[PDB]
């Protein structure tokens, strides 16, 4: 399966061998087992050139997986500021929700990616968005002792 | 699936048997010395089926038959070892052929059968010619069949059995012998061509206008039918190629494997056929009950399966049209619950004498008429218990007759059941 | 890269000859194996002496057909260990092909496949050629497919089945054999292209202008359409470049994996436009399986053009048919027509009744109307099994009678599976 080799590459980060596999017509939106496209995997492990290659060949920027995770979720979780702005520029879902009720703003706030938090907010993030337990991004800064984040959330 | 071993047993067995070898030796271009003087490759393409010299074994308790064969035209070609003959005759006693005298010799026969099969690349099966009203052809033949069936159970058993009729011999024990023999064939053979002397006489008498038919006259009709039905086996061809494939497409129920053969056109002994028939004419010799080698009316029953063999140069397009025609224009006579049950095949080499010919092998439920005749004659004889001391003296039990009587009647009922069956 | 072809029964073997004859002309390979001239080595291997050998196995339970291969025009092309023959055939009996006779040679056959797979580095899967009504074609194939799903389970397997037709039918029991193999080979096949011998007969009588076609006539026509499907694998095209892509594009349901193939143009040897040939792909007369797609819903649709084709002409002909005909799709489909092109011209055989055409197209479409073909087999099957006709032959060769019913239920369930998708 050529859609499975393109996931192997986009994950481990062999920039050159993506172009090889894609020139062989590999499925840009090929799902693995839990529904993760190559754009998901590259946006998780920080391979910026592989993200922009897949997006311009037609990668579902707002593709979800078995747990409702968009690539912007995973980029905002791990903290890849370079990739976050690339996805948003390609029409990413700034207020996407996943199976646990989190938005990308929730994940960037939990992991302390203050520089990414400000990017999401300026792209119209839902500051008052709630999760399953009922907590906003502002509640996380209150609960987690981060006053640098509380100030960045009320800006 | 290549070689076929042939056997002939009893007087009739060796008569129509030798006649068969005369016919197909010519058709394949073999002389009585055993040398090829033909002029075509389609002839030696599948000569390995019946020849090596014929792969033929000659059997009879009557030792005289030995010379009646060797003093015949192609009598020189048969292997001397393959002659296996007894001292005395059976004298129309099925028990003598099946239990006493025929049993003592049957071992010697199996020894030669083994020898011929031993040197076969890939055996297909066996082929027996014999009469059913006799003592040797019926009693020892059916005993030979069972003895081979158990020594060669992975092979086909194909018999050319001729039915007795009062019109050819006034011996009244023939209903006994034939009934006992039918009780064997329904259990022991994969396919059996039913040659009815009743029908051979009625054809030589009424259609060929011969006031007194001889054996030779009836034997001419037989040998010509045999080469016709064995045309597929002896020449290259797609359909019904080997013995097993034939039986697979002809016999839907194991006990109902008694074919009603018939072929066209009906010629006399060495007469001249002025105008070669047309394809629609040949085709209209199927339902024509005056062409059936068994004395049965296809109109009175239904066809389960049909195999047609057209020999000669003719239009494959026209044959297909005429066969597809005659099927649906008589759609009530072919069973509906077996789709595409009629199968046609063509062979470019015609039979010698005729420009075109057509043989019509059919599993018709009308064949129950034939078994009715034998059973009524058997029962009339058996209810008065005539000539039973012959058979019982040779070790047979009176019960056997009742079982064969009942077993043949069950065979008749089965044919009647599928005749009245419906697809709905 | 590589792909192994297997040919079972006279149908498989004799269609194989027609295809490898046509493959060697398309690749300029000589009958002796040489080449005065990669993408094509998906199908062929190479000797140290510059000789190109097919990656193929031929199987028949009886010599005659394969004997003509090793004494024919292409006797030097195959290694003698690739051509395998038994002695006793299956006699139009699935049981003998599968149980009695097939078990005597299955191990030798699987062993000779390993020798070709050991020569290969990144083996893709298997192409399988066989009849339906044949005893060998039905029984032995279904057995071999079971064992290949073990010894090579993690790879693809594609079928090329010969759907039976009374006009060339050799057996009464061909409905039985078809149902029986389709039951046991359903789980083990990823995709399967049916070929109705009636359509190939109809086509040869109308467009090739032949009164009574022979097997060579039908096989040559078949080999052309098979070549059109495998062209993407042999020349490195854009569409369907490997065996997985066939399932991706054409199979949105593991069970319903039976595409309808339509091929145009079929020109007698005694030029058309891109638009004209694409309209003929939606004409039932040029289908390989006799049915009416207008009575069914499309699950997918690919177009494989080859020859003098301008990519813009294709898009016009697509828009024409997408606007001027009403091709109904299912709602859960991309409903967009996939396309691929290979600029090499369709090769014909020197002497063939088929003429060299400038361009050609082969439309592969998984329509639900192909269920009509299954309905015709099931009906014939039902009539004979209602009286248990011919069943004793099968039961007497190692087969349980229940297997008949278990197969029929799997065919009835498949007819419901086609219905529910198209409503
Ligand atoms: N299109 C096409 N069909 C064929 C060809 N050969 C046989 N068939 C069809 O296949 C069906 C079964 O015949 P075979 O394939 O020869 O049977 P087999 O596979 O050799 O099996 P056995 O002979 O019983 O051992 C028949 O209905 C034929 O119409 C062929 O060369 N081309
Ligand atoms: N068609 C035909 N039937 C025969 C011939 N000879 C005998 N019969 C029939 O066979 C029966 C007699 O059996 P027969 O073969 O002579 O006895 P056997 O020598 O013990 O086998 C009678 O019904 C005869 O009509 C023959 O040459 N041709
Ligand atoms: Mg005698
Ligand atoms: Mg065969």
Is residue B64 located within the same domain as residue B187? yes
Nearest to B190 by CA among B284, B97, B253: B253
Is residue B416 located within the same domain as residue B304? no
d(CA C100, CA C396): 10
Is residue B220 located within the same domain as residue B274? no
Nearest to C80 by CA among C101, C103, C57: C57
CB atoms C383 and B336 under 8 Å: yes
Place of tokens 């694998």: C233
Identify the closest residue of chain A to C340 by CA–CA distance.
A25
Task: Name the region of B275 (left: φ>0; alpha: ψ -120 to 50; beta: rest).
Answer: beta
d(CA C134, CA B317): 24
d(CA C203, CA C212): 12
Domain range for B89: 2-252
d(CA C93, CA C393): 7
Ligand 2, pocket residues at CB < 6 Å = B 10-12, 15-16, 62, 90, 131, 133-137, 162, 164, 168-169, 174, 197, 215, 218-219, 222
CATH code of residue B234? 3.40.50.1440
Longest dimension (CA), chain C: 61
d(CA C374, CA C376): 5
B83's tokens: 């002659």
d(CA B376, CA C105): 52
Query: Please, what's the b/e burial string for C317-355 (b: 16 or more CB within 10 A of its CB; e: otherwise)?
Result: bbeebeeeeebeebeeeeeebbbbbbeeebbbeeebbbe
d(CA A6, CA A8): 5
Ligand 1, pocket residues at CB < 6 Å = C 9-11, 14-15, 60-62, 89-92, 131, 133-137, 162, 164, 168-170, 174, 197, 215, 218-219, 222
- C-alpha count within 13 angstroms, C-beta hemisphere, residue C242: 17
Nearest to B97 by CA among B65, B143, B129: B143
Q: Is the dihedral of CA B161, B163, B167, B169 positive or negative?
A: positive
Size (chain A), residues: 155
Identify the closest residue of chain C to B324 by CA–CA distance.
C167
Is residue B89 located within the same domain as residue B226? yes
DSSP-assigned letters across all residues of A34-101: SS--HHHHHHHHT-HHHHHHHHHHH--TT---TT---HHHHHHHHT-HHHHHHHHHTT--TT---TTS
Phi first, then psi, for residue B9 (nearest 5°) are: -135, 140
Three-class SS state of C143: helix
Contact indicator for C82, C56 with CB cutoff of 8 Å: yes
Same fold, C1-259 and C370-423: no
Is residue B239 located within the same domain as residue B262? no
CATH code of residue B384? 1.10.287.600
Which of B252, B287, B307 is at the close of a domain?
A: B252
d(CA C274, CA C300): 21
Discontinuities in chain A with C to N beyond 2.5 Å fall right after: none
Q: Residue C337 carries which DSSP code? A: P
Contact indicator for B201, B163 with CB cutoff of 8 Å: no
DSSP-assigned letters across all residues of C232-259: HHHTT-SSS-SHHHHHHHH-SSSS---P
Is residue B130 located within the same domain as residue B218? yes
Domains of chain A: 1-155 (1.25.40.20)
Helix A2-12 with A38-45: angle, nearest 10 deg: 10
User: What radius of gyration do chain B's Cα atoms show?
Assistant: 21
Place of tokens 């002025």: B274
Contact indicator for B263, B175 with CB cutoff of 8 Å: no
Identify the closest residue of chain C to B344 by CA–CA distance.
C170
Q: Which of B245, B302, B420 to mutate to test the interface with C (most CBs of C within 10 A)?
A: B245
Rounded to the nearest angstrom, the gap between the alpha carbon of residue B266 and the centroid of all alpha carbons in its chain is 18
d(CA A57, CA A30): 13
For the purposes of burial, counting CB atoms within 10 Å of the CB of B146, is it exposed (0-12), middle (13-18) or buried (19 or more)?
middle
C277's tokens: 């040939």
Is residue B66 located within the same domain as residue B135? yes
Q: In what order do the strands lie in the sheet with C359-367?
A: C260-264, C359-367, C298-307, C338-342
Provide the strand spans (E) within B348-382: 357-364
Beta strands C125-131; C3-8: pairing state: parallel
Chain A and chain C share a number of CB contacts under 8 A equal to 13
Q: What's the resolution in A?
A: 4.4
Measured from the Cα of B131, ligand 2's closest atom is 10
Distance C218 CA to ligand 1 centre (A): 12
CB atoms A3 and C248 under 8 Å: yes
d(CA C21, CA B422): 49
Three-class SS state of C362: strand
CA distance to A97, A116, A130, B230, per residue, from A137 (Å)? 13, 13, 8, 92
Q: Residue B299 carries which DSSP code? A: G
Name the residue facing B339 among C167, C212, C380 (closest C-beta).
C380
For chain C, domain boundaries = 1-259, 260-369, 370-423
Which contacts (CB < 8 Å, 24+ apart) does range A107-114 have? Answer: A107/A73, A107/A76, A107/A77, A108/A76, A108/A77, A108/A79, A109/A137, A109/A140, A109/A141, A109/A149, A109/A153, A110/A140, A110/A144, A111/A77, A111/A78, A111/A79, A112/A146, A112/A149, A113/A76, A113/A79, A113/A81, A114/A148, A114/A149, A114/A152
**Yes or no: domain C1-259 corresponds to CATH 3.40.50.1440:** yes
Number of neighbours of residue C37 by Cβ within 10 angstroms: 8
Number of neighbours of residue B331 by Cβ within 10 angstroms: 8
Is residue B210 located within the same domain as residue B316? no
For the purposes of burial, counting CB atoms within 10 Å of the CB of B29, is it exposed (0-12), middle (13-18) or buried (19 or more)?
middle
Is residue B78 located within the same domain as residue B140? yes
- H-helix or E-strand spanning residue B305: strand B303-311
User: What radius of gyration do chain C's Cα atoms show?
Assistant: 21
Three-class SS state of C9: helix
* A27 and chain C in contact, CB less than 8 A: yes
Is residue B135 located within the same domain as residue B247? yes
- Ligand number with the minimum distance to the CA of B135: 2
Nearest to B135 by CA among B88, B170, B167: B88
Contact indicator for B252, B239 with CB cutoff of 8 Å: no
Q: Residue A8 carries which DSSP code? A: H
Question: Which of C99, C134, C198 has the most ligand 1 atoms within 8 A of CB, as the residue to mutate?
Answer: C134
Nearest to C368 by CA among C325, C314, C417: C417
User: What radius of gyration do chain A's Cα atoms show?
Assistant: 16
Beta strands B123-131; B83-85: pairing state: unpaired
Helix A2-12 with A15-23: angle, nearest 10 deg: 160
Is residue B262 located within the same domain as residue B246? no
- H-helix or E-strand spanning residue B130: strand B123-131
d(CA C90, CA C102): 8
**Catalytic residue from among C46, C146, C245, C403:** C245
Q: Report the CATH number of the C260-369 domain.
A: 3.30.1330.20
Number of structural domains (chain B) is 3
Contact indicator for B213, B205 with CB cutoff of 8 Å: yes
Number of neighbours of residue C38 by Cβ within 10 angstroms: 12
Is residue B151 located within the same domain as residue B49? yes
Give the domain C370-423 fold: Helix Hairpins (1.10.287)
Measured from the Cα of C92, ligand 1's closest atom is 24
């Amino acid at each position: 399966d050529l859609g499975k080799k393109l996931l192997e590459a986009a994950r481990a980060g062999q920039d050159d061998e993506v172009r090889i596999l894609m020139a062989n017509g590999a499925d840009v939106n090929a799902t693995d087992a839990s529904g993760l496209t190559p754009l998901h995997l590259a946006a998780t492990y920080g391979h910026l050139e592989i993200v922009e290659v897949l997006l311009k060949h037609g990668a579902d920027v707002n593709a979800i997986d078995i747990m409702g995770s968009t690539p912007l979720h995973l980029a905002a979780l791990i903290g890849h500021l370079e990739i976050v702005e690339v996805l948003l520029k390609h029409g990413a879902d700034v207020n996407a929700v996943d199976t646990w009720g989190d938005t990308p703003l929730h994940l960037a706030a939990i992991m302390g990616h203050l520089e990414i938090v400000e990017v999401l907010l300026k792209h119209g993030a839902d500051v008052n968005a709630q999760d399953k337990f009922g907590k906003t991004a502002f509640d996380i800064s209150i609960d987690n002792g981060n006053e640098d984040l509380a100030e960045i959330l009320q800006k | 699936m290549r070689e076929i071993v042939h056997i002939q047993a009893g007087q009739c067995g060796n008569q129509i048997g030798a006649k068969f070898w005369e016919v197909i030796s010519d058709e394949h271009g073999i002389d009585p010395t055993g040398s090829y003087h033909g002029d075509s490759d389609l002839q030696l393409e599948r000569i390995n089926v019946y020849y090596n010299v014929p792969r033929a074994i000659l059997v009879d308790l009557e030792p005289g038959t030995m010379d009646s064969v060797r003093s015949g035209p192609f009598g020189q070609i048969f292997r001397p070892d393959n002659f296996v003959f007894g001292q005395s005759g059976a004298g129309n006693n099925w028990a003598k052929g099946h239990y006493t005298e025929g049993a003592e010799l049957v071992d010697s026969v199996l020894d030669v059968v083994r020898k011929e099969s031993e040197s076969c690349d890939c055996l297909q099966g066996f082929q027996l010619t014999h009469s059913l009203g006799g003592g040797t052809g019926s009693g020892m033949g059916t005993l030979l069949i069972s003895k081979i069936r158990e020594e060669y159970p992975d092979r086909i058993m194909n018999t050319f059995s001729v039915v007795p009729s009062p019109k050819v011999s006034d011996t009244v024990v023939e209903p006994y012998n034939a009934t006992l023999s039918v009780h064997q064939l329904v259990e022991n053979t994969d396919e059996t061509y039913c040659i009815d002397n009743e029908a051979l006489y009625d054809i030589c008498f009424r259609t060929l206008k011969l006031t007194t038919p001889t054996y030779g006259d009836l034997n001419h009709l037989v040998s010509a039918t045999m080469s016709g039905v064995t045309t597929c086996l002896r020449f290259p061809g797609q359909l019904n190629a080997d013995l097993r494939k034939l039986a697979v497409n002809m016999v839907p129920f194991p006990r109902l494997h008694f074919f009603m053969p018939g072929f066209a056109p009906l010629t006399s002994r060495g007469s001249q056929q002025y105008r070669a028939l047309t394809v629609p004419e040949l085709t209209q010799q199927m339902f024509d009950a005056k062409n059936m080698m068994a004395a049965c009316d296809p109109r009175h029953g239904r066809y389960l399966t049909v195999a047609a063999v057209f020999r000669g140069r003719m239009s494959m397009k026209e044959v297909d049209e005429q066969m597809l025609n005659v099927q649906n224009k008589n759609s009530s006579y072919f069973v509906e619950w077996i789709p595409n049950n009629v199968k046609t095949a063509v062979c470019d080499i015609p039979p010698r004498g005729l420009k075109m010919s057509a043989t019509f092998i059919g599993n018709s439920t009308a064949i129950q008429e034939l078994f009715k005749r034998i059973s009524e004659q058997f029962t009339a004889m058996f209810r008065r218990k005539a000539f039973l001391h012959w058979y019982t003296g040779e070790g047979m039990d009176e019960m056997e007759f009742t079982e064969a009587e009942s077993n043949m009647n069950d065979l008749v009922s089965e044919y009647q059941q599928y005749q009245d069956a419906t697809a709905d | 890269r590589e792909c192994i072809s297997i040919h079972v029964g006279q149908a498989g073997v004799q269609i194989g000859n027609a295809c490898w004859e046509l493959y060697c002309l398309e690749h300029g390979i000589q009958p002796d194996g040489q080449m005065p001239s990669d993408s094509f080595n998906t199908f062929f291997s190479e000797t140290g002496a510059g000789k190109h050998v097919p990656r193929a196995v031929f199987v028949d339970l009886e010599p005659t057909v394969i004997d003509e291969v090793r004494t024919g025009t292409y006797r030097q092309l195959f290694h003698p260990e690739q051509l395998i023959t038994g002695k006793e055939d299956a006699a139009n009996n699935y049981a003998r092909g599968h149980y009695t006779i097939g078990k005597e040679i299955i191990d030798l056959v699987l062993d000779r496949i390993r020798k070709l797979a050991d020569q290969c580095t990144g083996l893709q899967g298997f192409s399988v050629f066989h009849s339906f009504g044949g005893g060998t074609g039905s029984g032995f194939t279904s057995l071999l497919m079971e064992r290949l799903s073990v010894d090579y389970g993690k790879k693809s397997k594609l079928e090329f089945s010969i759907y039976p037709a009374p006009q060339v039918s050799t057996a009464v029991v061909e409905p039985y054999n078809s149902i029986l193999t389709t039951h046991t080979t359903l789980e083990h096949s990823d995709c399967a292209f049916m070929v109705d011998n009636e359509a190939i007969y109809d086509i040869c009588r109308r467009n090739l202008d032949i009164e009574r076609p022979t097997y060579t006539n039908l096989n040559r026509l078949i080999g052309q359409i098979v070549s059109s499907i495998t062209a993407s694998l042999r020349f490195d095209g854009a569409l369907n470049v490997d065996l997985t892509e066939f399932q991706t594009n054409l199979v949105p349901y593991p069970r319903a994996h039976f595409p309808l193939a339509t091929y145009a143009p079929v020109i007698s040897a005694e030029q058309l436009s891109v638009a004209e040939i694409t309209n003929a792909c939606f004409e039932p007369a040029n289908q390989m399986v006799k049915c009416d797609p207008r009575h069914g819903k499309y699950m997918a649709c690919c177009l494989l053009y080859r020859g003098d084709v301008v990519p813009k002409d294709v898009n016009a002909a697509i828009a024409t048919i997408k606007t001027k005909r009403t091709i109904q799709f299912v709602d859960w489909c991309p409903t967009g027509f996939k396309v691929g092109i290979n600029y090499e011209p369709p090769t014909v055989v020197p002497g063939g009744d088929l003429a060299k055409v400038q361009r050609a197209v082969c439309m592969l479409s998984n329509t639900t109307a192909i269920a009509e073909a299954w309905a015709r087999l099931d009906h014939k099957f039902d009539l004979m099994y209602a009286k248990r006709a011919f069943v004793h032959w099968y039961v007497g060769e190692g087969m349980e009678e229940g297997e008949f019913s278990e197969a029929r239920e799997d065919m009835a369930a498949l007819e419901k599976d086609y219905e529910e998708v198209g409503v």
